[PDB]
Design a protein around this nucleic acid. Structure first.
Ligand SMILES: [Ca+2]
Length: 179
DNA sequence: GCCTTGCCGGGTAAGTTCCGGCGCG
DNA sequence: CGCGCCGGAACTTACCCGGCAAGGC
C-alpha cells in the first residue's frame, strides 16, 4: 500500500542493521515484544527515523508508544508491540519475495545502517552471509556488480563490496532514490 | 598513472537481555 | 492469574573505519 510497504522495507533494513527484533520472557508469566533501531545520534532518530516509524504505526493501528531511550553508547528507538514485532518478523521471513520497490528500500535501509558512509568505497558489513547473498542477487538483477568476502576473520563479519564500476547506478538507483 | 579492492587491526557505535513496574480482561 | 506495554541500563562485540599493497587496464 505501497507507501507502507516501501517504508516498511526501509525500516526493516534499519532494524536488521542497527537494530533488532526481541521476544522477551520474564517472571511471570510476563512477556514483551520489541522492535528496536539503535543509533549514535538523537537527531537522525528523532527527525528522520521516528516519523517513518510513527507513520507506519498509525497506518497499522498499533497503539504502542515510540520510546527513545538514551544508552551510554547510543540512543535506542523502541516500540514495545506484539503486533509490530510480528509484522516485521513475518516480513523478514518473508524477504526473498520482496518486489523491486521493497528490494530497493530494504537495501537503502541496510546501507544506512551497515554502510560505508564516506562512499569512497561502497561496502555493507554483516555476519549474516545468507542475507548478504540475497542482497547480492538483487543487486545483480539491478546490474550492480558486487562480491562477498569474509572481511573480519576475528568476528566472522562479511563484507558485500559494491563494484565502483557500478557506483553511479548504485548511488542513484538505491542510495538517493526518491522512492 | 590511476583506480579498484582484498586484507586486516583499532575501537566505538551498535545490538542483546537483564531489571522493576504498571495495564488490562 | 496470565500475559503484554513502559522506561531503564548493563554488558559484549559486530560493525565501520581507514591504511597498505597486489593487481587490472
Ligand atoms: Ca550503523
Amino acid at each position: 500500500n505501497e507507501n507502507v510497504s516501501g517504508i516498511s522495507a526501509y525500516l526493516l533494513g534499519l532494524i536488521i542493521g542497527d537494530g533488532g527484533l526481541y521476544k522477551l520472557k520474564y517472571k511471570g508469566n510476563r512477556s514483551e515484544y520489541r522492535v528496536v533501531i539503535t543509533q549514535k545520534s538523537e537527531n537522525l532518530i528523532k527527525q528522520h527515523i521516528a516519523p517513518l516509524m510513527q507513520f507506519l504505526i498509525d497506518e497499522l493501528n498499533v497503539k504502542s508508544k515510540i520510546q527513545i531511550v538514551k544508552g551510554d553508547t547510543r540512543y535506542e528507538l523502541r516500540v514495545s508491540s506484539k503486533k509490530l514485532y510480528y509484522y516485521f518478523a513475518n516480513m523478514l521471513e518473508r524477504i526473498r519475495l520482496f518486489n523491486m520497490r521493497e528490494q530497493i528500500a530494504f537495501i537503502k535501509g541496510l546501507y544506512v545502517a551497515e554502510g560505508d558512509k564516506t562512499l569512497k568505497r561502497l561496502r555493507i558489513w554483516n555476519k549474516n552471509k545468507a542475507l548478504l547473498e540475497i542482497v547480492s542477487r538483487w543487486l545483480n538483477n539491478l546490474g550492480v556488480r558486487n562480491t562477498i568476502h569474509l572481511d573480519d576473520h576475528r568476528h566472522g563479519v562479511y563484507v558485500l563490496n559494491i563494484s565502483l564500476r557500478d557506483r553511479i547506478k548504485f548511488v542513484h538507483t538505491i542510495l538517493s532514490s526518491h522512492l
